[PDB]
Amino acid sequence: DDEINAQSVWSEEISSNYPLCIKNLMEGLKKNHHLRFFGRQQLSLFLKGIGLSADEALKFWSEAFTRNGNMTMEKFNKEFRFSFRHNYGLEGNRINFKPWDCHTILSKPRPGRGDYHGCPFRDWSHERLSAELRSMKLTQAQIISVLDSCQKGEYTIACTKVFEMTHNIAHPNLYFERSRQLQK
């Protein structure tokens, strides 16, 4: 809990290790104080995978959903608490939901307006990707190479390129673990 907790998953240190899908989900959560079902699952199971405990997850999700009076804690408890507890087996279900790999993520229904699940390398325009990658300090040649992979439908190669270019078989939690090791 010292390293990964409801607070540190918002830190720059820990979030600098997130792949683009998780960054997108965290941004949608921060902006909207809510995520629709598929994004809730993609992000909550990723965070479980990096070691966010059940207690810290319930702190994280209830704080994020109730921010700015978006909903009362009563509403969170009546409409969402069970769903997050279920993801951690706290209601006795005896199914240990695993984090989604990239194939599972890509195989879910493609995101529409208001959805943040999926894979940005597939789901964003080249203009939106280039803007994000510029913000991550990549150069034009680097971005062209990433977009080359996206154009070919090779989304996990695009993501691997972004990893290589921002640092010194396909799974968001592997991206996180590899990146986190390079801080350590």
Contact (CB, 8 A) for 163 and 147: no
Contact 170, 102 (CB under 8 A): yes
Residue 25 CB, shortest distance to ligand SF4, in Å, is 9
Q: Which is nearer to ligand SF4, 54 or 147 (CB)?
A: 147
Q: Other C-beta atoms within 10 Å of 127: how many?
A: 8
Nearer to ligand SF4, 78 or 98 (CB): 98
| Gap between the Cα atoms of 3 and 5, Å rounded | 6
Minimum CB separation from ligand SF4 for residue 173, in Å? 9
- Minimum CB–partner distance for residue 172 and ligand SF4 (Å): 4
| 81 versus 122: smaller Cβ distance to ligand SF4 | 122
What does the binding site for ligand SF4 look like in residue numbers (CB under 6 A)?
19-21, 102, 105, 119-121, 155-156, 159, 170, 172, 175
Q: Shortest Cβ distance from residue 97 to ligand SF4 (Å)?
A: 17
Q: Which of 25, 16, 20 has the alpha carbon at shortest distance from 120?
A: 20
Torsion angle defined by CA atoms of residues 109, 111, 115 and 120, in that order, rounded to the nearest 10 degrees: 120
Q: Which is nearer to ligand SF4, 54 or 170 (CB)?
A: 170
Gap between the Cα atoms of 138 and 85, Å rounded:
39
